[PDB]
Each structure stands twice: as structure tokens, then as C-alpha cells.
Amino acid sequence: FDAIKIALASPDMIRSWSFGEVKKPETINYRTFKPERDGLFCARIFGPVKDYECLCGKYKRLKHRGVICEKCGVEVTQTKVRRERMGHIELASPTAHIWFLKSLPSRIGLLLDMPLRDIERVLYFESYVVIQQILTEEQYLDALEEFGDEFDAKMGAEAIQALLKSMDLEQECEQLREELNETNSETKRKKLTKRIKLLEAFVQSGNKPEWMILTVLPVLPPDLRPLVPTSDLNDLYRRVINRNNRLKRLLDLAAPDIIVRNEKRMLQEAVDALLDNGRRGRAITGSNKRPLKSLADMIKGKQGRFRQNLLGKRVDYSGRSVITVGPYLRLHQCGLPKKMALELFKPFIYGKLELRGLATTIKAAKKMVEREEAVVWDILDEVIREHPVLLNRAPTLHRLGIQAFEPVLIEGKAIQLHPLVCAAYNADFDGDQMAVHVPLTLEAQLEARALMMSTNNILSPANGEPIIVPSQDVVLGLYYMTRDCVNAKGEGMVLTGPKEAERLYRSGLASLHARVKVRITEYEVAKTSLKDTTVGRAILWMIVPKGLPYSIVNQALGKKAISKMLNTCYRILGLKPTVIFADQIMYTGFAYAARSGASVGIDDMVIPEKKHEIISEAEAEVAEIQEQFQSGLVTAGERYNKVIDIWAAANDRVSKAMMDNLQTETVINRDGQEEKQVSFNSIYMMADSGARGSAAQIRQLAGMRGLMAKPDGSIIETPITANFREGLNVLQYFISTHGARKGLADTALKTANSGYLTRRLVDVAQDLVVTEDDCGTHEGIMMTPVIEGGDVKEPLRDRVLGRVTAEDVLKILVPRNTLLHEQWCDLLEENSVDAVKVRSVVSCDTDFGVCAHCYGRDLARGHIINKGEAIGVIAAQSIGEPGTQLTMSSIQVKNKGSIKLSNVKSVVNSSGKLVITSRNTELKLIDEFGRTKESYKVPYGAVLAKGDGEQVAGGETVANWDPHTMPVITEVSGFVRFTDMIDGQTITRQTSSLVVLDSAERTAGGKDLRPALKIVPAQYFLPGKAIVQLEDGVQISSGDTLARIPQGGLPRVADLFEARRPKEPAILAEISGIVSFGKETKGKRRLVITPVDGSDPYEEMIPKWRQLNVFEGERVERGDVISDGPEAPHDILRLRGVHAVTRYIVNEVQDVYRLQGVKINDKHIEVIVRQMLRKATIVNAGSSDFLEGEQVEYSRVKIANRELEANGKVGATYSRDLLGITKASLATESFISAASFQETTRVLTEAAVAGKRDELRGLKENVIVGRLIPAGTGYAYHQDRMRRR
């Protein structure tokens, strides 16, 4: 099959699926386990329960395949044929479908142009409709005697089916087509544009409206709801057939009208409870108080087929046990147990036994395995000598959770997961029990060796740093070697080479760390020099490859230092000398850690003598602050900020006093003067290396742990004065748990949110596959690193690392189609230029994917991204992976740089200050080399001490402003005249000071009159709640103040990726022009801009509690905020631009990513917003086919536009819509991929009424339908499939 078409079930199509008709409500017989005639499990209707055995017991021995008997009529067949054959029931009354009824919007409600409330009153027999208008039961007795001969009315779904039979599809669509062309409505147009979209999609899929109302209801096959020695579905099916049989008992005896309306309602409620649960008048519960599982409850949610049985299928030839260290084995190897791998490779044993000829059958080969003799293990090691085996963690919130290995047979039922990939799994050896998998066939084993092996998984897909990072022990063995000590054994002796240092240390006459001179041979060709190298660093030179330099080895080699040592070996040496180098790091870092003896103890770290004096000073410092509060010197808020000020300064004073007692404490007499050298404490060796302890973790260990947080978010006033070495107090440990149990409740609850964020990120980005090599488009975004902070954290070295540029930047410097390598990115760093135009993901215009050169580098391989790789899945897995890592004033230019102001119409002031006039100002600290390092967005009203275009020295205050009061600044100088500014009506004066009244609390005498201030030209208007200190008759300058106007992490990733509006959205300006005040007597301020060439009647809606950023006297610009606060993701796309929203979502996700310390590349978020920009709202139809009000995909309007550019008619433009990770994953094509995410009761009704025959594109679709993935080597199969079709 190549496509799956979904539509409405016809009454003839339901009977075409069913081979028989069921009439019995009871499932089977009560006495024996044999089904009755015309039952739910009957063999005549569906098929026999045994393999080639009739129900009576006469036709056996497999001598027939399609015989039909005459005694019982049972068509004997296989057991799996019973899983396919279905049944149907003939209902006495029609029944409305509950999925199409309770959906939002209602499919039955939009056809009958009724809301949800009245469309269910006629269905459950409370009201009547005609065959329209809705009349109740008490209006039906008067309708038969007044208009009874003109119109006829019924109730239930029979009247709904008769009304859908009366209306026509072409007649109702014509009446709605002429209504949308002439209407001045926005909210009413939204209700009508979804109704005509429902009608226009019926004629394209050829679905009648009467097919939605079910006259015939199909049932499941009996193997789909099997009885067991009582289920949660067959008892629910007994609720429907009992109601179906009772309605057949009412027609023959001429039942009255009162009893048939109640029986049809319970028949309608039985189908409403069968096909759905939770969307009715009352959800049906079982006998044991649990909610009963309906047909919808077993298709949606975690317990549905889409998540438990189509995405969560259990896997044979696959086991699960805890993981171990296993230091003796190689990187591509692990450890599989003897009796476990024998049970996993059980047909692999049977294949090798029949190949050699030991057991040439399947029966005696099972006896050879279960006997466990000596010849079974020699067969087993030949199979598992080079067989790849997938090691798999049960939570995989990352790409590296599934890695292949080449295991060896060991004792013990635990797997020996490799320590080098232990940081790649992000899972320590804390007793975690996790799965294991094998590939059976040879085309799947090569996928494990070429892609899933641990050898070629060195670099992380998230960042340029390798994911193979030595975490705790191998880095500790490396750190004890690479150290310098005076007065050591064998100090100041010559060595012939690096291999002689192994002879020097294993004999025991010299220490592991001694300042000597070893001869080394460095490569790129061989150079030799006698440099200062200790004994431990000389062990490393036999471990590193030839071409690795020495300048990366000569440091202390901590965890942060050897992260680049593994990266430089991948860069210039290649992958083939990386696997041997990484294994020999793990061989040396483990074996020398045994010889190291780096431990933890009470004699290792020591409480410094300055700690007991600092705590005695801090307890004496809080005594005078508390005595000042009793006398009344400070307030409650000023005292609370002062205690944390003097304790965090004491926490930083005890941090440095404890650090020097671990850095330069223990000294040894080196035959002379007592010199200050680095201490050899094992706690500092685990702290300077950054292996397992940070600078703040040892601060909590030997010193006081500092300020702890409250559960609501505040800080404890009195922190822990003691430390963990001498023990805490009872209350000190109790307030220590206020941040520890809170952080662990933060950890155990954000994994349910980041796990939901992992599903939300993949399900919207699974359609995006790289499909082209080169397209030819020069469109892209402008790249700028983080500048708003004081110090640069992520520069342009790691920002544009491995991304092909769109347009060639200047100092011809770089080409266009050339990928930026590690040498090309360093060429951009030495030039010190910014504003690089690179090819972005949202700028590529291809079908169901992006180009390979428009993406960049994979950052997991050394070359470019391969054509046919899941490019949206590798990024969405590296977004939820830091989700469980993060938690759920004046200016002072410290650095040196020349100031620069953009889009500022600065004028002269009275004192010569660089006064600003625009709202959106951004400072640029341009250096002498040509780049910038610092930036600040100062508010409107900041007085700059110096102008623009000169150098600003470091440590000098350049500006100052007031954040609480917003002033107003004119443009030119001149006399001031109070135009329309009178007192008594709208201006009162409080004592020497003037103030304008608020628009809400003012009287009814000055509501129409608005104040103004014109020059004597430009007119300046002031808003309410302002203080005017200027009197009439005083000459003022341009920069003088005229009106004083006074006033976590994972939710930020969740709110921004869903493209939702926050609690304080920032309003943007549509057309640059003149903004007025607004209109009163409305309850909310409205914004209107009437420029010369703009749109006049456009109006906004601003609440009264919000304030206006820009003034109504100054000219507004497109891209200036009206409300202060966080910018809304929907308004930055529609107004500022398409390339502006992809810069805002990335830089704000990366803003909260730097607070935790994780490094995620910017292109990984850029492939998510491309799957958020793939839905668009077309602004004009023109020569196109679909309606303007209809919202379709960007991939559908881009191929249709290229067809128009080849023709004579022009192409219709479109406006993109930022549908989030929840919105765009549902309202899209490939309905199989949308039904697995969520809203299976809704999006399957959205696809049945609209056709939506998917073209087998997408990754979630091919997983559920079970065929080759179009984002691997199956893309080459899909490439040949397009060549076949």
C-alpha cells in the first residue's frame, strides 16, 4: 500500500466489512466455553475459535479452506482470519456519532448550524426539530394543531438523519459562498469560514452528510476483545446489544410514544458510552468504581493503541537487566551474560547447529540448549564474536540512549555498559535496570555498526563538544598523574622517552608526579624538544596518537580540559585513531586511579581557622542589625535585604578562605626555602578538575552551604552557620531540606513535564527530513551572539560553527556554497566581524523538509549532514535532554569599547548630553577590532554623559535613568504654551505641583477635553497620571523633562514552544504613523493609527490596567512595543517579520539554557520553529483554488505558487501563522501522525470529514503503519519508490 484514505462510513460500507449479523447480547454460554448462535463470539458470524476446526466438531484434518457447512453454517478457517472479520447490528432507530458530536467544533453542529447545547437536546429526546428551528416538548402539542399539516417534526437522531437527507451539499455551500464576500465581521467570519470549509471538503472526498448518522453500527472482531477465564469491553458491548434487542421488541407490539422515546435515548446513550467515554451526560463506571474502557479509551491516551500498541510495541529477542562498569573491555564491546544471551540468541543457536550438523532439527536443538552442556558455549562465542547488540535505557530523553555494542560472554546476569558512554546515556551506575536489544537480519546489523555503534558516537548532536566525556574516575586517574610536586622521589632526572616513565613508576623508586625532563616525539614531520614535563604526563604520550600535539596535554587535564583533548583528536587525527586513544585513556585513567589513592575523609579537607572567626563575626554582625530594628532605624524590607547581604558576603568570604586552605595549605621542604605550591588534597583534585564536584559543591561540603530557599521561593534569614564536617543542627538540617527536598520534588516532577516536552517536540518535528543537496536560495537570517550580558558566554565561534552561509559577508571574504569548517570559522574569528547572513532552517523552501546545505553540519560527524537523516528528531531529543537539567538600576560599562546608537534621532541638549527620543534604543559597544561585546537596552529618558562615535573607557558610567518614572522628551527648543490645559475640570494641583487626572476617576466635565503642548512644527501630547513641574513662560531645551509618569526555566521552554500568549503580552505597532489617545466610555482603551499612506479604520483593544510605552505625540514605528514585558510569539511574526520570530524563540530558549550550564546549538531550535512556521494563513485567493479564510500548510502553498510562476497568472501571497508544538502537530497533514500525539477523538473526525489521504510521508506515520523510515537508508528506498511511481 502507498496511501491511507479516511472518510465517513457508509451504511453499505459497514455491511461490506461485516460477514454476519449478531443478535445476541450474551457473549458466550455460561455452562461451557462455547459460543451460541448469532452471538458476539459466534463461529458462524466471525469464524471458529480453533485452527481448522468447526464449532460442531465434524470438519477437521485441514483438507479444506473455503467450505461452508449446512448444519450450523460455520465457515471454518484459520484463527487469524477471525481477527479480521467483523460484525454489524441493525438498529431500529438511527444513532448519532458521539465523536462527531462532542468534538470542538461539532461536525453535527456545524452542518445543522446549531451550537453544542441545542444539538444534544434533540438527540437525548428533550426537544424536537423540523425536517432549522428548535422547539421543546411543550411546544410540540401546539404545533400539531396549528402547523401540523404544513410541517412534520421528529426527535432523536432519526430527525437529524432526515434533516441531513433534506439538505444538499451544493445548495448549502452556495449560500455560504456569497455571505463571506460581503461582511464586515471578524469573530462572526471565523464561525462561518470553518463551516464552508466543512462543506467544501465533503464534495472533494464524496462523503454524504447522512453517513455521519449511524443507522448500522459495526462491532470489533472477537479476537480484538477476547474473553478470558469478564473483560472491560465485552461487558460494555452487552450494554448496547441489550438496548438494540429491546427496540426490536417494541416495534412489533405497537409500543406507545412515551416508552419508545426513553428506550431510544438509552440506546443512544449505549452507543455514546461504547464509542466514547468522558464526553456525555455522565461517564459510565464499572462495578469496582473504575471508569470503564470504551472504544475511544483504548485508542487514545497512554492506554490507547497509538501509544501502548503502535508506538510502544513489546520486542522479542530483547532482554532487560541492570548495568555494570566493565573496565577491561573495549569501547565497541560490552558484557552480555551467559544464560541471558543464550536466551536472546536462541534461534541464532539453532541456526549454527543446523549449519554445522550437530542437531539438524528443531526439536532436539531445544534439548541441547536446555541441557547446557559444554558444546553450546563454543557455538555461542562464534555468534557473539562480532554481532552488534543494542544497549537501551528505558528512559531515552536523548539520542544517545540507544547505542550498539559487540559483547563478550561473562558471568553474572548484568550488562557491562561502557564507562566512556556512561555520560552519553546520562545515567550513572545507581542500580538502574534498563533494556537491551539485538538486530536479527544483516541489513539491520549494519545499521547498528555504521550508525549506532559507540565508536562513531563520539561527538554529541547537540553541541560541538564530544558526548564521550570522562565523568568521575578515569578523569580522576588522569588528574593525579598530571600534577607537579616539589621534593618528590626522582626529582630532576633525565628520561630517554615517554615509555621509560612506565619503567620509572612501576618499579617504585620515583613518584607519579615529579618535575623531570622527558624526551618526546611530536608529529603533525617528527619534531623533538626537551620541555618541562612531569612523570604522570609522560605516561600520556604513549596513550595519545602521533598527530596529537603536546600543548593540550601540558595542563592539569581536568574534566573541562580533556573535553577538548577528545575533541582535538576527532578534529585533526580522524576517527580511526580516536577509538584506540579513548580506550587507552580509559585503560590508563582506571588503572592509575588504583595507584592514585584519591579518597574522601575527615583528614582530607579541613575546616579553616578563618571560618570560626567569620561565623563569630557574622553572628556579631546580625546582633547590631537586630538591635537597630528594635530601636526603629530600618524597616522590615530593608532589614531583610541587609541580612542576606551580610551573609552572602560572609558566604563568599568563607568560600575563599576555604579555597586557599585546599589550594596552598600543605607544604614540603624542597631542600631549601618553603615555596608556595599547589596542594595535593584529594578533595581539591576532584574540585579543580570539575569531575564530580564544582566550586559551589565543595563550598557546601567543607564550608557552610550558604542561603537556602523556602518552598514558596523566598530565602531563609538565618542560614546554616555550621558545615557537614562537624555536622549540622536539627533546624539547620531542616532548612537544608527546604531546598534539597524541594529540588528533588523539582527533579521528580519536571521529568513528567520534560518527558511530555520530549513527546511534544518530536511529534511536531518528525515530518522534517533533509531531501535536497542544493536548492539555490540566498534567503537567511542574521547571526549575532549574546551581547546583552556583561561578559560574553557563547561567542560566534560556537554559534555559526558548521553552518553554510546564505550571503557572502565582507571584511570577497567567504564563498556562499562552502560549508564553514573549523578552519573557516576561525578565519571569521580573527577578522572580528558580526552580522553574518547564514542559511537558516525557516528560509529553505522545499516540500515536507529542508535542504542539506540550508541546515549546516550535523556536529556528530566530521563531514556535512548526510542526505536522508532525521534532522528534526535529533534536535528535539537534544531539547528535552537539558529539560531535566534546568529547574522548573544604573549602568556601569566595565569593559572598554566605543559606544554606538542605532535608529536614534539624537539632538543637542542644554548641557550637551546625548539625549534620546526613540523608545527602542540599543547600545552598541563597538571595539577597535570591529566586533561588540556589551549591549544594554536603556529605557526612554536616559541621559547619556557622552555622545555617539567616540571611545568609552572601562569602568565609566555612560548613562543613568529612572525605572519607576517615565519622562517625555521633545525634539526642538522654543516657547511652551499650555494648549487646552485648564484647571478645575481635568487638572488639579496638590501642594506647588501639578498633576493630570486619570481617565477612570475623573468627573464628567472634562472627559472630552484632552491636554496638548505645541511648539511655537511638532505637537507633543501627554497621557494621564503625569506630573508637570514646568510652569508657563519658561524657555526650555529639547532634553528637558516635562511630565513625570510614575508607576521558571522549564515553563519558559514550555510557554515559548507552544507559541502561547503570556499573562503580560507586548503589543506591537502595525503601520508607522500618528497614534491618538483613544475613546472613553468603553471600559478599555483602544488604539488607532491614521497615517497618510496607512490603514485608517484599524482598531485595537488594550485593557485599562496596562500602560502605554510609546507616547501619542511621537511617531510610532513598526516593531516598537506598546506594552512593557515579555514579547508575544504570535505578534512578532505577523508584524516584525518571518526572520524575526525565529531569532526571538531561539535566543530566549538559549537564554534560560545558559542559567543551567548546558550548551545547545542554535540551529536545533531553528528546526522546531520551521515546523511551527509550516502553517500559514493566506491573505488573498486570487488565482488559487482554496479559500482565503482556510488555513492550510506552507508546503501546499509553496508548490502551488511555483506552478503559477511558470504560468501567466500571478501567485497569491501568504501570511505565516505560528502554530505551536500542540497546534501544528494536529491541524496538519498525515493524520496518522496527528492521531498519536493527542485529540484522537477530534483529529480523526477532522480527517474523516475532509479526506486527507496522506502520501506516506512523515516518520510517525511510517512507524505506526510499520514500514521503512524515510529518514535513514529507507530514504534511498523512498527515492527508488518515487522512481517507480
Binding site: 544483516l442 541489513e443 546489523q445 549494519l446 555498526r449 550508525l451 577509538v579 536522508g868
Partner: protein
């Protein structure tokens, strides 16, 4: 084998390497096809990758070997 970086530099794309090694493994399993590499005790997964280590098996020259078997 240990690493696949020497076989991927002959073909380029990684997903094209799996397609040519799977078709080489099908010939070594059912239809004879003794390899030109020295045969060792390892399985046919490594033999499908050892032939691309020196470059005697490629995706372009494996299709002309399938047509050569069809002419005989």
C-alpha cells in the same frame, strides 16, 4: 570491525553505505559470493565492511556485478 571511518570516505553518505553492505551481505549468505578479502573467523557483518575499507565494493560497481550474475 572497530571503526567505519575508512569505509565512509569511499562512499560519502552513511545511509548509502548501509545499502551497499546489505546487498553484499545477501550475496554472501544465499548465493555464494566468496569475498576478495582474506577470510577470517569473523561474521559476514565485518566482511561486508572490510571490502569497503580498501574500496573494492561501491554502490555503483555492485549494480554491474548483479547484472553480471544475471547474464550468466
Amino acid at each position: 570491525r572497530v571503526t567505519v571511518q575508512d569505509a565512509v570516505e569511499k562512499i560519502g553518505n552513511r545511509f548509502d553505505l548501509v545499502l551497499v553492505a546489505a546487498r553484499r551481505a545477501r550475496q554472501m549468505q544465499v548465493g555464494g559470493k566468496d569475498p576478495l578479502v582474506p577470510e577470517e573467523n569473523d561474521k559476514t557483518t565485518v566482511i561486508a565492511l572490510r571490502e569497503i575499507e580498501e574500496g573494492l565494493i561501491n554502490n555503483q560497481i555492485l549494480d554491474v556485478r548483479e547484472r553480471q550474475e544475471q547474464q550468466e
